[PDB]
Amino acid sequence: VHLTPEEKSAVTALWGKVNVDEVGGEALGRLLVVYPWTQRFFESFGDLSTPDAVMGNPKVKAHGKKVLGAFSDGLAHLDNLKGTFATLSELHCDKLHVDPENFRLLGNVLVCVLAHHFGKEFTPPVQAAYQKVVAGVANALAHKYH
Amino acid sequence: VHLTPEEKSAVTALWGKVNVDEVGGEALGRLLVVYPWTQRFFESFGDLSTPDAVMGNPKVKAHGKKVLGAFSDGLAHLDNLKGTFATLSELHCDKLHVDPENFRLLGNVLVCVLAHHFGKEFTPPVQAAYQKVVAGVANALAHKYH
Amino acid sequence: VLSPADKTNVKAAWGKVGAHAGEYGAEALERMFLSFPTTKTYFPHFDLSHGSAQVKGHGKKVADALTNAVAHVDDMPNALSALSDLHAHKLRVDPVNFKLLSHCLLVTLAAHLPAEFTPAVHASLDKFLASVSTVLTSKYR
Amino acid sequence: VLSPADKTNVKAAWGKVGAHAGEYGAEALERMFLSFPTTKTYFPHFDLSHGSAQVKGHGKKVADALTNAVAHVDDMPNALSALSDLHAHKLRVDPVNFKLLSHCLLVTLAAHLPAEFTPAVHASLDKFLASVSTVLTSKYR
Numbered sequence: 286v287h288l289t290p291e292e293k294s295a296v297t298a299l300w301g302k303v304n305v306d307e308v309g310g311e312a313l314g315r316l317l318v319v320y321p322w323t324q325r326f327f328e329s330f331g332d333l334s335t336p337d338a339v340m341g342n343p344k345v346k347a348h349g350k351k352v353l354g355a356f357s358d359g360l361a362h363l364d365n366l367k368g369t370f371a372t373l374s375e376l377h378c379d380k381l382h383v384d385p386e387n388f389r390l391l392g393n394v395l396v397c398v399l400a401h402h403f404g405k406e407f408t409p410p411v412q413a414a415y416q417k418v419v420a421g422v423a424n425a426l427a428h429k430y431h
Numbered sequence: 432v433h434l435t436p437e438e439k440s441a442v443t444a445l446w447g448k449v450n451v452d453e454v455g456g457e458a459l460g461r462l463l464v465v466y467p468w469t470q471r472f473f474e475s476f477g478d479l480s481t482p483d484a485v486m487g488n489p490k491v492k493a494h495g496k497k498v499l500g501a502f503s504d505g506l507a508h509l510d511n512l513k514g515t516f517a518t519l520s521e522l523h524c525d526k527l528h529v530d531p532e533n534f535r536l537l538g539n540v541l542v543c544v545l546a547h548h549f550g551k552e553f554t555p556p557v558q559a560a561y562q563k564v565v566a567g568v569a570n571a572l573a574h575k576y577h
Numbered sequence: 578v579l580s581p582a583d584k585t586n587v588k589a590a591w592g593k594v595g596a597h598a599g600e601y602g603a604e605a606l607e608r609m610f611l612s613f614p615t616t617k618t619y620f621p622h623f624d625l626s627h628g629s630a631q632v633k634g635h636g637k638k639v640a641d642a643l644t645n646a647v648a649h650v651d652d653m654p655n656a657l658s659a660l661s662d663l664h665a666h667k668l669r670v671d672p673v674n675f676k677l678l679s680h681c682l683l684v685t686l687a688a689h690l691p692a693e694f695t696p697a698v699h700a701s702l703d704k705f706l707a708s709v710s711t712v713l714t715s716k717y718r
Numbered sequence: 719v720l721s722p723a724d725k726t727n728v729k730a731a732w733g734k735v736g737a738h739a740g741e742y743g744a745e746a747l748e749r750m751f752l753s754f755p756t757t758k759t760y761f762p763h764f765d766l767s768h769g770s771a772q773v774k775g776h777g778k779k780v781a782d783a784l785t786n787a788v789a790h791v792d793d794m795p796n797a798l799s800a801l802s803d804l805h806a807h808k809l810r811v812d813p814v815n816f817k818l819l820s821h822c823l824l825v826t827l828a829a830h831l832p833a834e835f836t837p838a839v840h841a842s843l844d845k846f847l848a849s850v851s852t853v854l855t856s857k858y859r
């Protein structure tokens with residue numbers, strides 16, 4: 286992903302402060318609340334009928350953790366997102382049947398969640414760098430679709 | 432773009448039958464009628480109040496041919512769209528200020544016009560292959576935007 | 578909003594399609610699956626091979642709903658209420674895909690009705706499919 | 719369609735923004751220009767350097783218009799009418815760009831209102847901005 290070293294160090298530094306056990310849950314939760322149609326993939330997660338039922342759902346929180354762990358791992362290999370996500374891309378296509386547009390929706394929610402937690406420190410330049418990262422991740426998760 | 436050799440060949444054979452004067456004029460003119468806001472970039476072409484005036488505008492027609500000329504050059508350079516359309520991308524961004532999103536519009540219009548001309552011969556597989564070309568051209572025209 | 582000229586253009590265009598609607602519906606679906614493979618994720622249960630019967634049959638349902646919409650052009654939200662219900666609460670197709678099907682329908686029409694697919698008619702059918710799309714996603718949230 | 723709860727959520731959130739609207743609008747625009755540079759094509763004549771006085775002034779105009787939509791949340795198409803004609807006949811910005819600015823407004827609000835930017839509020843504001851964008855885009859053709 287075309288990232289300047291000014292972008293990569295800024296991205297990486299912020300990431301250092303992220304509590305993945307919380308942000309992943311917030312991000313998955315907000316996806317399900319703001320874009321309620323994405324709930325079609327998580328029916329086995331139980332009650333998702335109100336914002337509190339979603340945000341506090343423990344299956345949502347646990348799953349958000351896995352998403353972010355895989356995300357973090359992508360930040361460790363920004364020069365090879367495709368390879369890094371190849372098998373996840375195959376799974377989401379062939380087994381889970383998930384429309385890749387949902388990867389872009391999640392990316393944008395993550396950016397909002399980053400904003401919320403970091404405030405002023407989520408500067409416009411820092412945002413611009415994260416937007417490139419989340420589009421790169423979205424593209425890589427979409428690459429094995431056929 | 433990832434083209435199959437029978438996709439590379441489906442595209443090439445059909446293009447050899449295209450009347451560039453007619454198809455260019457029609458693609459650009461339809462862009463201006465179907466998506467009226469694109470007229471913002473061609474105020475000096477003249478009268479574009481109605482569809483008949485648009486389709487009858489000699490400058491639209493002449494400009495339509497030029498565009499499809501550049502597009503033809505791209506078909507011969509399919510393994511290097513980026514380098515082929517680099518100067519043109521620069522021009523479209525720094526001199527003309529054209530939102531690249533318009534490239535996608537023209538592309539889709541172009542695909543409809545081909546279908547209009549070739550009927551039965553513009554089969555689903557043939558369309559699929561042209562959809563990749565059109566996307567590849569749009570993405571290459573957008574490459575030098577900053 | 579659809580103008581009187583648009584409604585006229587669309588009833589005209591659709592009138593010719595006539596008894597071929599089911600076939601164009603299936604054709605549109607086939608072109609969408611091949612041109613835009615992500616759309617296949619919404620039909621994991623369908624046999625998507627060329628000419629298969631699920632696509633055939635489903636093509637007919639799509640076309641029929643469109644005929645309903647043409648016949649009720651001045652009254653779409655009402656005529657399409659139940660379909661809109663079904664899309665928002667059960668199918669839940671991401672809004673971007675409506676643009677892709679819409680485009681494939683236009684291509685299908687251009688290719689089967691060359692004399693009827695003038696620029697003004699191309700403009701009205703695009704506005705019409707967008708209006709239908711707006712209606713089917715109107716109750717998503 | 720906005721629901722009673724949405725309207726309540728938007729009034730509350732915009733109420734806390736208060737007299738910070740202009741400045742949140744200019745920040746939104748700066749965020750948009752940097753993250754989605756294709757949007758700069760609509761502002762070739764503007765100085766877009768950080769702190770630009772033109773960007774600040776324009777941010778205020780955007781925020782004033784949002785404030786008027788919130789003031790007339792039950793009559794938005796009519797309160798925004800003049801703005802909607804301007805967009806359709808003069809400005810002529812491609813609809814996709816509206817999603818890009820809306821997203822940047824939300825980031826700006828989340829970065830400044832930690833306590834009020836709860837999930838339901840975020841949901842409501844995202845709907846509100848989508849409805850504003852639809853109004854401003856409704857007379858394009």
Ligand code: HEM
Pocket residue numbers: 323326327329351352353355356373376377381383387388391422426
């Ligand atoms: C940043 C993008 C994403 C990443 C990195 C990611 C990663 C993962 C991982 C690691 C798993 C577990 C894989 C396994 O069970 O073997 C998973 C499962 C899943 N993902 Fe995602 N995912 C992403 C986005 C999405 C989104 C947007 C959706 C749909 C809205 C989605 C739908 C699912 C579903 C349904 C499962 C299986 C849930 C279950 O256990 O029942 N994913 N994802």
Ligand code: HEM
Pocket residue numbers: 469472473475497498501502519523527529533534537538568572
């Ligand atoms: C298929 C993608 C496109 C290609 C290959 C293309 C190609 C060209 C070419 C070859 C020129 C001539 C420039 C010169 O004289 O050196 C041109 C000019 C121009 N293009 Fe494009 N074009 C494309 C799409 C668009 C679209 C979608 C727009 C806006 C909707 C646009 C806006 C313009 C404008 C405003 C000019 C200058 C017109 C004038 O001379 O008054 N282009 N383009």
Ligand code: HEM
Pocket residue numbers: 616619620638639642643660663668670674675678679709710713
């Ligand atoms: C022009 C807009 C569309 C219309 C008018 C339309 C119409 C319909 C109709 C009439 C049905 C059958 C409903 C019933 O059982 O009574 C249906 C089902 C369905 N539609 Fe569409 N549709 C549209 C767009 C799309 C899009 C864009 C997709 C996804 C790419 C999609 C995917 C589906 C799916 C998955 C079903 C259920 C299929 C099944 O399992 O039987 N539709 N639609």
Ligand code: HEM
Pocket residue numbers: 757760761779780783784801804809811815816819850851854
């Ligand atoms: C929430 C959506 C938006 C609102 C409420 C809004 C509001 C406004 C207002 C009040 C004006 C000043 C009009 C006047 O002269 O009275 C304006 C102008 C303008 N807007 Fe926006 N706008 C929106 C979205 C956009 C977006 C998406 C773009 C393109 C990226 C854009 C680009 C422009 C441009 C280029 C001008 C004219 C600048 C100049 O030359 O003075 N706007 N808008």
